[PDB]
């Protein structure tokens, strides 16, 4: 799954099978869970 990992002080986007070894909801804090935010008239800041 796509997620992130610390390399030095950089958090780099990673695909890591370590996620696939995990059960579903674990904590609330995953690292492989994402949100997709489209520009929406209801929010409307300046891109």
């Amino acid at each position: 799954f796509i997620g992130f990992h610390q390399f030095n002080n950089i958090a780099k986007l990673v695909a890591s099978n370590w996620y696939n070894r995990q059960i579903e909801r674990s904590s609330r804090t995953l690292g492989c869970s994402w949100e997709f935010i489209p520009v929406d008239d209801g929010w409307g800041e300046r891109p």
Partner: protein, 1150 residues
């Protein structure tokens, strides 16, 4: 990690990483080891406190040993232990940042009369000085109390910063609920606090907030906690002080931020770039100031609790001495504890009780004297204080909520950068850098108080005996008036009833008789302790602990505690009902300078006042929430703790009863040696099962009492808030109307529109959010505990890495997996399935739970597809040793579930028709409380049986998946420590089943470009065939038996070449191979026909029924596909919406 590992207590002095240094200005010297830049460990007792102290000054809960850490062996063990803990902390990015920050956090230097540092240790000869921010010692006088002290008070309060000494105790820990305290987090707490000292931001000793109302005392008295400790210690408590907006302030915060900037500035303009100084100092300073002061205030244990997945006490965690009697456990590094923390985690770590537990000083805050009518003492019980300082006096009454307003904190710490700053080598020492250390002395006052009515602490105490022989009794008065005195107080009704029913019986001789006894002991204990009843309350339905009243003597004067509680409500459980103090406000005046303003400006200026006001409302509400927590929840948490202690007291009684019976049989009986051996192993498992049951009960009292406390906020506190707020906005509304009428420069139409814009109503302050109330108690710890204690003992996962197949267990338990290297993986129902070839391939799972026993319950489930050949009985999966345990076999066309105990009693149950080479979901449920076996195949319940006749199934700790002689596929294998219900099975089965994939007759994924034959749900054995009528060709089924129509051959096609598997809502073209390739079209009569030209082919939407796993549906333009009425005789495939629902289900068989 790269903490210095090269040290032992016998390491020679090198004057670099090992020194002998002077303690403050004293005549005393000590050895110190440098484990990291500016960070030292001094593996002896703190020098500043006498090791032998007067009896009068020994604090409650303390352990005093002058010979502790005296020997070289102990000192080394210490030094290694700390090194081990620092390694663990440094091994996680969060704690690595913390240590790095602390390292670069050097105090601000003084000026010329070049710059003089205050953080250094002096050599004894006073010609050599070593840079140190932090020095970690062993304990002071009291060897269970950690501490963090400052080198110089002044420098800790003034923005310069001061060196920090830490007193730590790596060797003892205690249990809180189900887990052991992790010394690593205990040390992180001391480290966080030193940040305050290193930055010179230590608050006045007087900056103190209310922590806990002392509801034990006859008078009104609060425990207080310094802001520093509240902010550092984490848990829930801080959420009440630290709020948005803030209802609580002090000049401390604004001023600390001020002085910080002053010092930053002195650095920026002067020190940085000054060549007279040098990098080892100025570079560190530069990093110290990359931080914001706010980052330190926002940093606390809750954060590390999460990052390290460490459990910690989350409620009143600085008051625990009052709520709890600690029992200490030894920790050996690294056998018990290593760089990954406790071996086997905080729950299941095996730690030995400390022999020191008996040396613990007991000095009660008050003593409850329970007399009888004749004024003579029946019992004397102890209540212990929290340790905190008190009053003085009431904070809420005299605190004015200010009307005028004037996650990650380690983000800005750079590890790489800091690690490259050369160590401080040449130090120019500042002479007076420290205070004479003065030890704290404390005399503990005790109150005696008399009562004719037993307090909860009385009923608790009656639940203990030191009598080797004792009897359970449900009469409290009889127990404490005992002329024995052998009686002990118990509410376990089912257990007492069972014990009585067997009183006259012939003694236990067979092992079988012991098991029958032990099992009933266990079931009855479970029934007694987990008892709950749901009731309707003011705020809802609450799940009530049934025995609560009989345990603590609360609402216990009725014949039923439950109905009396339903009657009187949540507030009736606590002793101090009215603690609220209406807060002092800032009265409302609108400036006289706005009286003549023009509309636009008047308008937008009242808008500002409107916001300030609504924010002010929010502050007030917060203030009420804090009072609730401090005054009210504190009392429910006391109830929670006492109730939990009651459960432990009862559990202990049970275990002792069991242990005596086992000990006795082993002592004198004819039971075979080998028999006794099994009995001993088995009983151990039962004692675990009893703790698991105790745990369910301790969760019950937590939910019950937390809900109650929240109900008290809605029912009692909240409405007082609402009263206060409508008086408040009624006032505001007045003053604002009176103001607007007095406005000179606006007209009358303007006044009415303005008054209307600015008016407040109740909705402006109805802040109650019940979900937020509930979410308070979900901490990282509560979550971690859920995940560590959930029913999964095995959850099998598998996936394909490049050049590797991965198999593992997600349960988070101790399960070990061993498997053939060449085992292959194939997509199953929802995921990759294991392929066992039947010949050499096997896999095995190891968990101590797997051995089962007499009293535990479990469930096994998995998906299985078997390419069925032989009828011969063959091991598939099971756990068996010495011919006990369970096995699932392949037999005939089905499975057999076998269960057999050590006495030879058996379950042998044939499950018909499981090898069709179609996937099936097998669920097996073993319930010892209901004595019930449940077996499900797919969505059906195939067997429901009594297992009252099966006793001890103790097997090995290994489950073996063999699948002898029958190549098969296994997917999602799971073991649970609890039984499964029919609702759960259905939910598991169907949830997994809709992943968007369409399936073939075998519930394998439907593939594009693969040849299938087509079947209608209604005639399941009759394939679709093609027949021509008028020089064109249609699709029907064969109702003329062997009319020698050939089964027609189908292939699904996708507009997308890359698409492999068929999914819900896909657009599809149906093709057939006859002579050439023929594609499906819809006629004008809605009858399907095979045609020549792919272009004309109709694109159909494929989908499926959520409850029919192997079937699919087909539609065009909203018109679904089904079988027509009899015609030829032939039944045509037609596109029509008016037939029976069953006719729209199809399946493809390969």
């Amino acid at each position: 990690m790269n903490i210095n590992d090269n040290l032992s207590i016998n390491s020679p002095v090198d004057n670099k990483n090992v020194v002998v240094v002077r303690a403050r200005k004293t005549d005393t010297v000590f050895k110190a080891f440098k484990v990291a830049p500016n960070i030292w460990v001094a593996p002896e007792r703190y020098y500043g406190e006498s090791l032998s102290i007067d009896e009068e000054y020994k604090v409650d809960g303390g352990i005093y040993d002058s010979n502790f850490l005296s020997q070289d062996s102990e000192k080394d063990k210490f030094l290694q232990a700390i090194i081990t803990l620092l390694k663990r902390i440094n091994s996680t990015n969060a704690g690595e940042k913390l240590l790095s920050l602390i390292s670069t956090a050097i105090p601000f230097p003084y000026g010329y009369i070049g710059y003089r540092e205050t953080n250094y240790l002096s050599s004894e000869d006073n010609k050599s000085f070593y840079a140190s921010n932090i020095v970690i010692f062993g304990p002071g006088a009291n060897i269970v109390e950690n501490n963090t002290v400052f080198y110089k008070k002044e420098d800790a309060e003034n923005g310069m910063g001061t060196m920090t000494e830490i007193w730590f105790q790596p060797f003892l820990t205690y249990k809180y609920d189900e887990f052991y305290i992790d010394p690593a987090i205990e040390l992180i707490k001391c480290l966080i606090k030193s940040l305050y000292f290193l930055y010179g931001i230590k608050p006045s000793d007087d900056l103190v907030i209310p922590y806990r109302l002392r509801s034990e005392l006859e008078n009104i008295e609060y425990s207080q906690l310094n802001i520093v400790d509240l902010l550092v210690s984490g848990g829930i408590d801080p959420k009440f002080i630290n709020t948005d907006p803030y209802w609580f302030t002090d000049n401390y915060f604004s001023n600390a931020k001020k002085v910080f900037e002053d010092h930053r500035n002195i650095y920026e303009t002067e020190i940085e770039g000054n060549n007279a100084i040098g990098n080892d100092i100025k570079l560190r300073l530069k990093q110290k100031f990359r931080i914001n002061i706010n980052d330190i205030w926002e940093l606390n244990l809750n954060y590390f609790s999460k990052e390290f997945s460490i459990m910690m006490p989350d409620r009143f965690n600085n008051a625990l001495k009052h709520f709890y009697r600690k029992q200490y456990y030894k920790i050996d590094y690294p056998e018990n504890y290593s760089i990954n923390g406790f071996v086997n985690g905080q729950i299941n770590a095996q730690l030995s009780l400390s022999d020191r537990n008996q040396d613990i000083i007991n000095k009660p805050e008050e003593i409850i004297n329970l007399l009888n009518g004749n004024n003579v003492s029946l019992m004397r019980s102890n209540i212990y204080g929290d340790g905190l300082k008190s009053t003085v006096d009431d904070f809420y009454s005299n605190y004015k909520i200010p009307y005028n307003r004037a996650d990650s904190s380690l983000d800005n710490v750079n590890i790489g950068v800091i690690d490259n700053i050369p160590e401080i080598i040449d130090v120019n020492p500042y002479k007076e850098n420290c205070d004479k250390f003065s030890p704290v002395q404390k005399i503990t006052s005790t109150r005696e108080i008399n009562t004719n009515i037993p307090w909860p602490i009385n009923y608790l105490q009656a639940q203990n005996t030191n009598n080797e022989k004792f009897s359970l009794s449900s009469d409290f008065v009889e127990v404490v008036s005992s002329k024995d005195k052998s009686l002990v107080y118990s509410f376990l009704s089912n257990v007492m009833f069972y014990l009585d029913s067997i009183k006259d019986n012939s003694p236990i001789d067979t092992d079988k008789k012991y098991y029958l006894w032990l099992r009933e002991i266990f079931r009855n204990y479970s029934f007694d302790i987990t008892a709950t009843q749901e009731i309707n309350t003011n705020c809802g339905i609450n799940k009530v602990v049934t025995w609560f009243g009989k345990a603590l003597n609360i609402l216990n004067t009725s014949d039923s505690f439950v109905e009396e509680f339903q009657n009187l409500g949540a507030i009736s459980l606590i002793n101090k009902k009215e603690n609220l103090s209406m807060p002092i406000i800032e009265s409302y005046e609108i400036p006289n300078d706005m009286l003549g303003l023009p509309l636009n400006d008047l308008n937008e200026k009242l808008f500002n006042i409107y916001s300030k006001n609504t924010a002010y409302f929010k502050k007030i509400y917060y203030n009420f929430l804090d009072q609730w927590w401090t005054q009210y929840y504190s009392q429910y948490f006391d109830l929670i703790c006492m109730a939990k202690r009651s459960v432990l007291a009862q559990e202990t009684l049970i275990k002792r009863i069991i242990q005596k019976k086992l000990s006795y049989l082993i002592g004198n009986s004819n039971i075979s040696s080998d028999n006794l051996a099994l009995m001993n192993l088995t009983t151990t498992n039962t004692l675990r099962d009893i703790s698991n049951e105790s745990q369910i009960a301790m969760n019950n009292v937590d939910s019950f009492l937390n809900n109650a406390a929240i109900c008290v906020f809605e029912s009692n506190i909240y409405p007082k808030f609402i009263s206060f707020m409508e008086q408040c906005i009624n006032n505001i509304n007045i003053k604002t109307k009176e103001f607007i009428q007095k406005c000179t420069n606006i007209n009358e139409d303007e006044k009415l529109q303005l008054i209307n814009q600015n008016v407040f109503n109740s909705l402006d302050f109805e802040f109650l959010n019940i979900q937020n109330m509930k979410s308070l108690f979900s901490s990282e710890t509560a979550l971690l505990i859920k995940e560590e204690t959930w029913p999964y003992e095995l959850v099998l996962y598998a996936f394909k890495e490049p050049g590797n197949n991965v198999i593992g267990d997600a349960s988070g338990k101790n399960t070990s997996i061993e498997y053939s290297k060449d085992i292959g993986l194939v997509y199953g129902i929802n995921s990759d399935a294991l392929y066992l070839n039947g010949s050499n391939q096997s896999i095995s799972f190891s968990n101590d739970f797997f051995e089962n026993g007499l009293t535990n319950s479990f469930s096994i489930y998995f998906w299985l597809r078997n390419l069925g050949k032989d009828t011969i009985k063959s091991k598939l999966i099971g756990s068996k040793e010495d011919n006990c345990g369970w096995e699932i076999y392949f037999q005939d066309t089905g499975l057999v579930f076998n269960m057999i105990d050590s006495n030879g009693n058996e379950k042998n149950i044939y499950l018909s028709d499981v090898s069709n080479n179609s996937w099936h979901y097998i669920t097996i449920s073993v319930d010892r409380l209901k004595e019930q076996l449940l077996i499900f195949i797919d969505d059906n319940l195939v067997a429901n049986e009594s297992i009252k006749e099966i006793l001890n199934i103790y097997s090995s700790n290994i489950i073996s998946l063999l699948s002898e002689n029958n190549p098969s596929y296994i997917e999602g294998l799971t073991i649970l420590n609890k039984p499964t219900t029919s609702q759960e099975v259905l939910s598991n089965y169907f949830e997994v089943l809709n992943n968007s994939y369409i399936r073939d007759s075998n519930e394998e994924r439907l593939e594009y470009n693969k040849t299938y034959q087509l079947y209608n749900y209604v005639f399941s054995d009759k394939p679709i065939c093609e027949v021509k009528q008028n020089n064109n060709i249609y699709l029907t089924i064969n109702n003329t038996n062997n009319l020698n129509l050939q089964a027609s051959k189908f292939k699904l096609l996708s507009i997308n070449p890359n698409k492999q598997y068929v999914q819900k809502l896909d657009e599809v073209i149906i093709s057939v191979l006859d002579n050439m390739e023929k594609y499906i079209d819809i006629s004008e009569d809605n009858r399907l026909q095979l045609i020549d030209n792919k272009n004309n082919a109709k694109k159909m939407i494929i989908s499926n029924d959520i409850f029919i796993s192997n079937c699919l549906t087909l539609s065009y333009n909203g018109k679904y596909i089904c079988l027509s009425m009899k015609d030829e005789n032939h039944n045509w495939m037609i596109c029509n919406n008016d037939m029976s629902k069953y006719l729209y289900l199809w399946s493809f068989k390969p």
